DNA sequence: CTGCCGAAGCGAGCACTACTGTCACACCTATTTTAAGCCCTTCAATCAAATCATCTTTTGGTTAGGATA
């Protein structure tokens, strides 16, 4: 279930640890790197942009702290 | 017309280190020779702290490997 990555590393059998396995998976996890879009992400992105943006300047990536699976 | 002697307030003795006239002998330095240790300067050889140049780790945006909504 993408959980207990110590067990995942042990099952891998190449002497990897949980942290390395998780790092590699997250760097190649479609669920994390959101090529997709969701309604709540769009709504909250619009809300934060409208709250903060002045003129043509918006906090393009500082919104990522609030919305998951982004950069 | 001059002169004696009282009343009250004072007082005593007991309770089983600054100068000056001399004076000779100290102070003082003329140099020799070591043997290991001296203080300060003064520059030179070596060092290490800080700064610059460039490779690289990651933080916002564009590209065409890559994808949903």
UniProtKB/Swiss-Prot annotation:
Disease connection: Neurodevelopmental disorder with motor regression, progressive spastic paraplegia, and oromotor dysfunction: An autosomal recessive disorder characterized by delayed motor development and developmental regression after the first year of life, followed by progressive spasticity with gait alterations, paraparesis, and oromotor dysfunction. Most individuals have cerebral, cerebellar, or basal ganglia volume loss.
Myb-like domain: residues covered: 32-71
DNA-binding region: 5-29
Listed name of the protein: snRNA-activating protein complex subunit 4
Name of the gene: SNAPC4
Organism, as annotated: Homo sapiens
Compartment list: Nucleus
TM stretches of this protein: none
Described purpose of this protein according to its UniProt entry: Part of the SNAPc complex required for the transcription of both RNA polymerase II and III small-nuclear RNA genes. Binds to the proximal sequence element (PSE), a non-TATA-box basal promoter element common to these 2 types of genes. Recruits TBP and BRF2 to the U6 snRNA TATA box.
Superkingdom as given in the UniProt entry: Eukaryota
Subunit relationships: Part of the SNAPc complex composed of 5 subunits: SNAPC1, SNAPC2, SNAPC3, SNAPC4 and SNAPC5. SNAPC4 interacts with SNAPC1, SNAPC2, SNAPC5, BRF2 and TBP.
């Amino acid at each position: 279930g993408h959980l207990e990555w110590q067990k995942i590393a042990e099952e891998l059998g190449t002497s990897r640890s949980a942290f390395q396995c998780l790092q590699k998976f997250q760097q190649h996890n479609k669920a994390l790197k959101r090529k997709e879009w969701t309604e709540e992400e769009d709504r909250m992105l619009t809300q934060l942009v409208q709250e903060m943006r002045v003129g043509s300047h918006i906090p393009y990536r500082r919104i990522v702290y609030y919305m998951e699976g982004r950069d």
